[PDB]
Design a protein around this ligand. Structure first.
Ligand SMILES: [Mg+2]
Length: 856
DNA sequence: GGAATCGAATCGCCGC
RNA sequence: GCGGCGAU
DNA sequence: TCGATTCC
């Protein structure tokens, strides 16, 4: 109810504190200091308002218990409630005679769960309905206990395998009513199949539900210090009542956590001065001594950060500080267009005017449900991104602080940042421009080609596309509202950003001062890095590591290989077979048709396999996907949209064709990028052996403990992969879920994506240092595997990003160094089981320097 | 040991 | 944690 | 499905 406004003293500190004002005015003067510290003061003020609205929305809907300010008392109140749940259960079982009316209802539910539900529904009722009456409150337990007892029967006993199917569609429902409707329809379906044992739920009558709840107030008073009973007008049977007795003592305890957590969530804005350079682990970026100091590495534990406190990494610190020094400004011309069309369209480039059936309906019904969520989810940030773009639009320059994740990828810290979407990327441009010149004009035109989606042809055709559309770009730049052509492109606002700079070179010639960031994007960075480590010529050429006759499309290379076997499987290959198969649930044994590869191939050839069929499987390979994961991709990306849109008449049995294509895609991808597949296998074996508590069964003692996986990037950034799992969790059907060990599978399921993402972070960090010290490059646009600068320095960043990768993998065998880190950490019995280093192929890294389409 | 079973990237914002 | 969006 | 991991 009452929240401490924490802004009075500590939010007044950051402006009025001496030392933060001292070191910042010494660099940029007092007046930039007074604005920067007031802007950081504002950022905390917009964030305390962010909490209080969310807290006030939670109390309106009765959602006060799932905040992290109500958690730390709740996590210490359940261990006493469970005892008094048992203690009442142990008081009457020894007494002979009848049960008290509610004893039987309390037993069907897990004694930890009933502890929770009596807590939350009482705070839900009092903070929303303002009524202390037991008739509303004792029913609040009793209705929701009956909800969890009846519908948790599905999750508990008769459908533990079938719940895993219906769990996802229950999660996609939002709100207690919608999850209740779905759980009602599910239960009625199973009783038609006779799944839950055939007994339909006999609903508790009203007088039962109140009796269930008047229990759970009484065990709360004896168990915990929360709520102490109060009796009203005793002796008058007309006026005999008892308050809910919710303790104001504990309401203060959530307020000292509501107020404390409201000061630690700031809405991070950009910087009007260059951000404070990183000299240590905390403190910089933003200049003030705030309640939330920026961390150099965004770790999930404070211990994980403290290992970084002493490690000597001069080149990591150099690379972040150079990146922070890039002066950005808001593209005023792009913002003028964006300020107009967003007032008319929810997404300004969305709908431009231009020239077994029950499960298909249910798929279409869920489509508008998700798109209604999607439309609300995309418009609220677009309004915010426009506000932040409009706020700093008149500033001569703004700056973005930078820190890193726990693997070493570089992230801008402000919520408005160059790392956002196309509109935000188009709304931002560099401030320190140069005369564009001949080379800058050429690379500006190339940057224009990639904004329009023309990135699959060589540079002369990319140059040619811009020149043929000269009158289209000029008419778009002269008036962007009379010509929608820029909005039709792949990157619309960034293309319009190119359109104005192209117009400036047309008006002012090659002496035009241009500061547009010209991005260069690595094709598939993980596969690019994996092929470079093991020197795969065939894999490297597929992601343009090598000079090729044209741009190489790794999605279409796989699709060509799939269509090769598809036409081979149309001539030879298995015929259709009849196989006996049983559904495990009904037990019924049926004799269905299993299509041979001959009939399966002719189905796919009727559909037509292009790079759209195999795109997602290649993209998710570096994330760990393999032949099984491709099957649900093929069914979701290709097969089901075909059936819904009139095609799929070939796909008589969709799950058979999805697993057939997944077999073919994996056969093609794992044979095209060989070094990628082998490298993730080696890393997975390493994290598997490191994360075992390997012990002898007879002695029972662990010879070697669970061990985390750790490596060092060639830049000098160290990484610690330590996924940790909790001991016990509780899951409620209608309501929300409530020491540690090493989560061994997450260690295996993360080692190869995190390592190659750590590798492209060191590649990025070495690139911005090499471009800034060997060349004069001072402005940087950095999206993980994307490299951007002003057009005059574009040719050097083009040359520098190739130089660092060539030098790094020539100077560092990052796989063999990774072996040297963990090898002394192995148990004997695992040492024989560790596979050897994957071999080195015939690729020469010096070819990368002349690779036109690596971009990185 | 042996079924019984489980499982098949990071980061941000918003909402429950 | 779950639902949705965006970035790689 | 194919392998690990997990309770037993
Ligand atoms: Mg594209």
């Amino acid at each position: 109810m009452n929240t401490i406004n924490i802004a009075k003293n500590d939010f007044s500190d950051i402006e009025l504190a001496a030392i933060p004002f001292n070191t910042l005015a010494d660099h940029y003067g007092e007046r930039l200091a007074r604005e920067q510290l007031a802007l950081e003061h504002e950022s905390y003020e917009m964030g305390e308002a962010r909490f209080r609205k969310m807290f006030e929305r939670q109390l309106k809907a009765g959602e006060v218990a799932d905040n992290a300010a109500a958690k730390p008392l709740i996590t210490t109140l359940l261990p006493k409630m469970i005892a008094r749940i048992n203690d009442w259960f142990e008081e009457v079982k020894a007494k002979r005679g009848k049960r008290p009316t509610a004893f039987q209802f309390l037993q069907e539910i897990k004694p930890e769960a009933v502890a929770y539900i009596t807590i939350k529904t009482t705070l839900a009722c009092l903070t929303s309905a303002d009524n202390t009456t037991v008739q509303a409150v004792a029913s609040a337990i009793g209705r929701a206990i009956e909800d969890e007892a009846r519908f948790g029967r599905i999750r508990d006993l008769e459908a533990k395998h079938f719940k895993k199917n219906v769990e996802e569609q229950l999660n996609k429902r939002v709100g207690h009513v919608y999850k209740k409707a779905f759980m009602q329809v599910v239960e009625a379906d199973m009783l038609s199949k006779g799944l839950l044992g055939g007994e339909a739920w006999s609903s508790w009558h009203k007088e039962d539900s109140i009796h269930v709840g008047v229990r759970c107030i009484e065990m709360l008073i004896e168990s915990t210090g929360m709520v102490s009973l109060h009796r009203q007008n005793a002796g008058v049977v007309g006026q005999d009542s008892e308050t809910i007795e919710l303790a104001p003592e504990y309401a203060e305890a959530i307020a000292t956590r509501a107020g404390a957590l409201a000061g630690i969530s700031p809405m991070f804005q950009p910087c009007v001065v260059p951000p404070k350079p990183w000299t240590g682990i905390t403190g910089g970026g933003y200049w003030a001594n705030g309640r939330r100091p920026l961390a150099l590495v965004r770790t999930h534990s404070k211990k994980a950060l403290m290992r970084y406190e002493d490690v000597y990494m001069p080149e990591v610190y150099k690379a972040i500080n150079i990146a922070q020094n890039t002066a950005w400004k808001i593209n005023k011309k792009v913002l003028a267009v964006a300020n107009v069309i967003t007032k008319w369209k929810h997404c300004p480039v969305e709908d431009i005017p231009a020239i077994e059936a029950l499960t298909a309906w249910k798929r279409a019904a869920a489509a508008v449900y998700r798109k209604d969520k999607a439309r609300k989810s995309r418009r609220i940030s677009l309004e915010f991104m426009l506000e932040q773009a409009n706020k700093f639009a008149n500033h001569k320059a703004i700056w973005f602080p930078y820190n890193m994740d726990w693997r070493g990828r570089v992230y801008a810290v402000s919520m408005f940042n160059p790392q956002g979407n196309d509109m935000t990327k188009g709304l931002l441009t560099l401030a320190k421009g140069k005369p564009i010149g001949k080379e800058g004009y050429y690379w500006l035109k190339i940057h224009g080609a990639n904004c329009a989606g023309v990135d699959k042809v060589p540079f002369p055709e990319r140059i040619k596309f811009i020149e043929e559309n000269h009158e289209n770009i000029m008419a778009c730049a002269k008036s962007p509202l009379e010509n929608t052509w820029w909005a039709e492109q792949d990157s619309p606002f960034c293309f319009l950003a190119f359109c104005f700079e192209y117009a400036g070179v047309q008006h002012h010639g090659l002496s035009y001062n241009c500061s547009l960031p010209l991005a260069f994007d690595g094709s598939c960075s993980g596969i690019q890095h994996f092929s470079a480590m093991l020197r795969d010529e065939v894999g490297g050429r597929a992601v343009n590591l090598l000079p090729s006759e044209t741009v190489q499309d790794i999605y279409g290379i796989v699709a060509k290989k799939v269509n090769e076997i598809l036409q081979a499987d149309a001539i030879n290959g298995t015929d259709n077979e009849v196989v006996t198969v049983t559904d495990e649930n009904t037990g019924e044994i049926s004799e269905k048709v299993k299509l041979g590869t001959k009939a399966l191939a002719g189905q796919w050839l009727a559909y037509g396999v292009t790079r759209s069929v195999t795109k997602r499987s290649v993209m998710t390979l570096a994330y760990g996907s393999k032949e099984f994961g491709f099957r649900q991709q093929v069914l979701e990306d290709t097969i089901q949209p075909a059936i819904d849109s009139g095609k799929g008449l070939m796909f008589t049995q969709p799950n058979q064709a999805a697993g057939y294509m997944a077999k073919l895609i994996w056969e093609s991808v794992s044979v095209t990028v060989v070094a990628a597949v082998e490298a993730m296998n080696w890393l997975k074996s390493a994290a598997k052996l490191l994360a075992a508590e390997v012990k002898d069964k007879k002695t029972g003692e662990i010879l070697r403990k669970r061990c985390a996986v750790h490596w060092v990037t060639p830049d000098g950034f160290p990484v610690w992969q330590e996924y940790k799992k909790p001991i016990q969790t509780r899951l409620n059907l209608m309501f929300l879920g409530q020491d540690s060990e090493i989560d061994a599978h997450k260690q295996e399921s993360g080692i190869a994506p995190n390592f190659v993402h750590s590798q492209d972070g060191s590649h990025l960090r070495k690139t911005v240092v090499w471009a800034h010290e060997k060349y004069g490059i001072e402005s940087f646009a950095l999206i993980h595997d994307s490299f951007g600068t002003i057009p005059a320095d574009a040719a050097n960043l083009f040359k520098a990003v190739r130089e660092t990768m060539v030098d790094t993998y020539e100077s560092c065998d990052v796989l063999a160094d990774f072996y040297d880190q963990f090898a002394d950490q192995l148990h004997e019995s695992q040492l024989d089981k560790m596979p050897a280093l994957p071999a080195k192929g015939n690729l020469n890294l010096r070819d990368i320097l002349e690779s036109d389409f690596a971009f990185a």
